[PDB]
Amino acid sequence: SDIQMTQSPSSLSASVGDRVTITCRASQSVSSAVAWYQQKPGKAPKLLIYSASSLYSGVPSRFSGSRSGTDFTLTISSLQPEDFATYYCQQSYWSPITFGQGTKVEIKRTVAAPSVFIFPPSDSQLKSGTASVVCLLNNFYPREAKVQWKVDNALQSGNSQESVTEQDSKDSTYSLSSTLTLSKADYEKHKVYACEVTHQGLSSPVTKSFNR
Amino acid sequence: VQLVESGGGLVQPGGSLRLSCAASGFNVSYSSIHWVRQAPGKGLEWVASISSSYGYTSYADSVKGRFTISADTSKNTAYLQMNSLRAEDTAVYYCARYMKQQSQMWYQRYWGFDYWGQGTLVTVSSASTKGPSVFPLAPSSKSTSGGTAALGCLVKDYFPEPVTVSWNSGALTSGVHTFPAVLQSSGLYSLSSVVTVPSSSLGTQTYICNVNHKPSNTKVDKKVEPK
Amino acid sequence: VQLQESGGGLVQPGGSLRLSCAASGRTISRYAMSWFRQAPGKEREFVAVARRSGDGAFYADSVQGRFTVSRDDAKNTVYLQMNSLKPEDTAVYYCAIDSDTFYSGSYDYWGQGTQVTVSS
Amino acid sequence: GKRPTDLALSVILVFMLFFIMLSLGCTMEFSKIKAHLWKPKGLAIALVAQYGIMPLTAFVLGKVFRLKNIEALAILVCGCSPGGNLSNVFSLAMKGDMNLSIVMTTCSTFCALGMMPLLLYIYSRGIYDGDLKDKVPYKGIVISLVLVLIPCTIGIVLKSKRPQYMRYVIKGGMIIILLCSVAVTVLSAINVGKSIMFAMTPLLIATSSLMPFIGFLLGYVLSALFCLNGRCRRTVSMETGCQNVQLCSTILNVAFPPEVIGPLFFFPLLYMIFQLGEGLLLIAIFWCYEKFK
Ligand SMILES: C[C@H](CCC(=O)NCC(=O)O)[C@H]1CC[C@H]2[C@@H]3[C@H](O)C[C@@H]4C[C@H](O)CC[C@]4(C)[C@H]3CC[C@]12C
Ligand SMILES: C[C@H](CCC(=O)NCC(=O)O)[C@H]1CC[C@H]2[C@@H]3[C@H](O)C[C@@H]4C[C@H](O)CC[C@]4(C)[C@H]3CC[C@]12C
Ligand SMILES: CC(C)CCC[C@@H](C)[C@H]1CC[C@H]2[C@@H]3CC=C4C[C@@H](O)CC[C@]4(C)[C@H]3CC[C@]12C
Ligand SMILES: CC(C)CCC[C@@H](C)[C@H]1CC[C@H]2[C@@H]3CC=C4C[C@@H](O)CC[C@]4(C)[C@H]3CC[C@]12C
Ligand code: NA
Ligand code: NA
């Protein structure tokens, strides 16, 4: 019973001074009841534009809003270093209030290939009855990357988890780590463990492996 | 105008919890108060709304029948009561006030949210507090041989999310990457820390982790040695 | 899916050469199409990638401010406009197509490539 | 609203209704009103059709046409309100019993005070969170009943005692009604033009169009089931198809915040037009049948 609001750009890359446009599509007519919010990591959202076109008091003149039927856009004229955050699209016409998925604006930069490292499980962890194999990606841009785990040249799924850091303050790159969780028995059953990493900056996938 | 929220904490699944929103500078009775939820790693989530003067109350589909919103004119506060909480309800809850309609211009409608609270964190888990276990990530003998070698320090199975790691008691800050905590299927978090070294015999220096778990009494200093 | 490289040949240093790559057999409107170079005696190097419309284009650290890449969705062809060439750019220029939608970097089909020489 | 334009519109509307009802009072006699009260058949049929099947029809329409909570609540509230004063004009337009029409209107408006909260409590379960019981405007209902009853007595007394003046009274009423109608139309047009065109779901328009025609057909069929004369059938049909929309507008504006009433801004205005347009169409059909039968 909700009104779906589709925010087409899920992630945007821009530099300082560029012009940024974020669109929002409403599944039904919501009149001009659309508002835009800006949220920074670890803080509460801030209102920017209400009624889809009006600039809230105190917000700089760069931000703008427009409505064309069921289509709403948010525009930034000249991007500033304090404008890199996440933006949300909201509708308030119908009783169940719904938000947009979100759009994160990031600093553009040149493509850097990831550096792949692997680590065998420690002796103490093995004695504890658990085996963890971790793979590291260092200083890669953009964030879009894929990590695959191959054990005995066989694909694995559902037994690995990954986490990504924020954009670096100086290098403006990303770091990725993937952890493979296996029991003691299955770890000793197999011999070779290989992790495959694919990225836009790599012509061919690179794979690091170790011998048990 | 300020919105201050409290009452967040840790509850068992199927339990109950009540959140408060102490408003200042305006009357909650004549205003509309909304509760917005943000699950960790996801976007915003509307929950419920209250309008005391009109006797109006609305709920989202997910929380309908389990949540009850209220407002007290005497204490100038708005309450949210949560019943039969599930594991999907863990999030940071925000208190928001709708735009104030202006009588001088009867035609515009001022759709939006003016003020937000700092937010309170609610976690719904059946696990118990436990100190972390530290496992070192020893660098391999052949890991991009040259001017770069990668070390690590893995802490696992700690239930309270806040945990702090460091290297050499703050003497190492360049190349240090602390990945965000991840919630495992068992119900406990795991964290990883990685540093980069010039690989000149691993820097011919001793590297020790410094993990501090404030919700417990744990301080483990593990030295990462090459195999 | 087959891709071919257009343009190349010996040009004066500091000149401009435009390269074209026509895609046939499958629509590339919702795909990502990139470019690669192969220096003689070395491995393939990334230069530039052209994502979908509106996502933007990214360039390698070496080729910055030059080697502009643009796409023609209607013509199913991308163009790599290189300006102020240098003798260090002498290499065989290949092309790649991103099979995955989410820009993981899974290049399944590669072009035959073309030879470009920047010598006096 | 509290704008001066709205209060001026309300004042002119009150004047227009007072003079209209005074003018209609001529065709009423106390003996026939007493006779209709003494043996209630059409009155009972009208009350049954008003507060027994029309709310059910509104509920079923809300369920069939997939409508949101607020739209369904608005339709349900419109399905429980009294007939209003448009039914008297419609009953005068076609040949029908007028004493029975005023009896129906007065009895329905008086019974609403005790029947309307109960129906709201029964039916709103599942589409409204809270209590609509004390949002019912009892004072407004009583005031409307008094302002309808007074011109009846004044006009009937004028007919019974002093027939000499009543041509003058009729001509004055007929000129005052025109002078008020043009002003009210101008004010309403100004408000509609100067306000934002709030969007409305097409299903709401379909429901509001179907709703009074269902009322008319139900009234006529129910009156046909129990052997009755043509005039009684027509008057009960017009009272069963006409509903009071100001009560629904007041309840909607008092039970919801301004930011939630957006979709229902033009609903009371649209509902009035549909029953006026459909009421006049049936008047033309009946008149064309009589002359060209
Ligand atoms: C009775 C209703 C209003 C509903 C009500 O009960 N209001 C109570 C109040 O205002 O106090 C009024 C409002 C609009 C009025 C109608 C029109 O707007 C004006 C119109 C003028 C024609 O010459 C004949 C009457 C006719 C057709 C009116 C009949 C009565 C109406 C229908
Ligand atoms: C139902 C509405 C207004 C009653 C109202 O606003 N109730 C809400 C409240 O008082 O809270 C009535 C009032 C007067 C009526 C109008 C005018 O007075 C008469 C006018 C005559 C034209 O031929 C067309 C209908 C038209 C344009 C009427 C349409 C309905 C009206 C607008
Ligand atoms: C002069 C006036 C009072 C006469 C009656 C006017 C009526 C019939 C007209 C005038 C304004 C109109 C509204 C204006 C705009 C919209 C938005 C549209 O998306 C749905 C219909 C809706 C909601 C209209 C419904 C019909 C409406 C209410
Ligand atoms: C038909 C529905 C929608 C509305 C009813 C009123 C309109 C349409 C007209 C159509 C024809 C009319 C009927 C035609 C003939 C008769 C028989 C007569 O001895 C008494 C009146 C009576 C019974 C009329 C009542 C009013 C009437 C039903
Ligand atoms: Na009714
Ligand atoms: Na009537």
Residue numbers in the entry:
A (entry chain L): 0 to 211
B (entry chain H), C (entry chain K): 2 to 52, 52A, 53 to 82, 82A, 82B, 82C, 83 to 100, 100A, ...
D (entry chain A): 19 to 311
Copied sentences from the primary study:
The sodium taurocholate (TC) co-transporting polypeptide NTCP (SLC10A1) is a secondary active membrane transport protein that mediates the uptake of bile salts from the portal blood plasma into the cytoplasm of liver cells. NTCP was originally cloned from rat and demonstrated to be localized in the basolateral membrane. Its activity is a key component of bile acid homeostasis and enterohepatic circulation of bile salts, a process that includes at least three additional transporter proteins, namely BSEP, ASBT and OSTα/β.2,3 In addition to its role in mediating bile salt uptake, NTCP also serves as the receptor of the human hepatitis B and D viruses. The structure revealed a fold that resembled that of the previously reported structures of bacterial homologs of ASBT,9 featuring two transmembrane (TM) helices that cross over at the level of the center of the membrane. NTCP has been shown to transport two sodium ions with each bile salt molecule.
We determined a 2.9 Å resolution cryo-EM structure of nanodisc-reconstituted NTCP bound to NTCP_Fab12, a Fab-binding nanobody and 100 μM GCDC. We expressed wild-type, full-length human NTCP in HEK293 cells and purified the protein in detergent, followed by reconstitution into lipid nanodiscs. One such Fab (NTCP_Fab12), bound to the external surface of NTCP with an apparent Kd value of 60 nM. We found that even at a concentration of 0.75 μM (12 times the apparent Kd), NTCP_Fab12 did not interfere with the transport activity of NTCP. Our structure revealed a tunnel through the protein that connects the external milieu to the cytoplasm of the hepatocyte and to the inner leaflet of the basolateral membrane. At its narrowest point, two strong EM density features were visible, revealing two elongated molecules bound to NTCP. Given that GCDC was present at a concentration that was ~170-fold higher than the reported KM, we interpreted the observed densities as two bound GCDC molecules. We termed the binding site closer to the external membrane boundary Sout and the one closer to the cytoplasm Sin. We identified two sites, designated Na1 and Na2, that are located near the crossing motif of TM3 and TM8. A key feature of the proposed mechanism is that the bile salt molecule at Sin is released to the cytoplasm along with the two Na+ ions, whereas that at Sout remains bound to the transporter, preventing ion leakage.
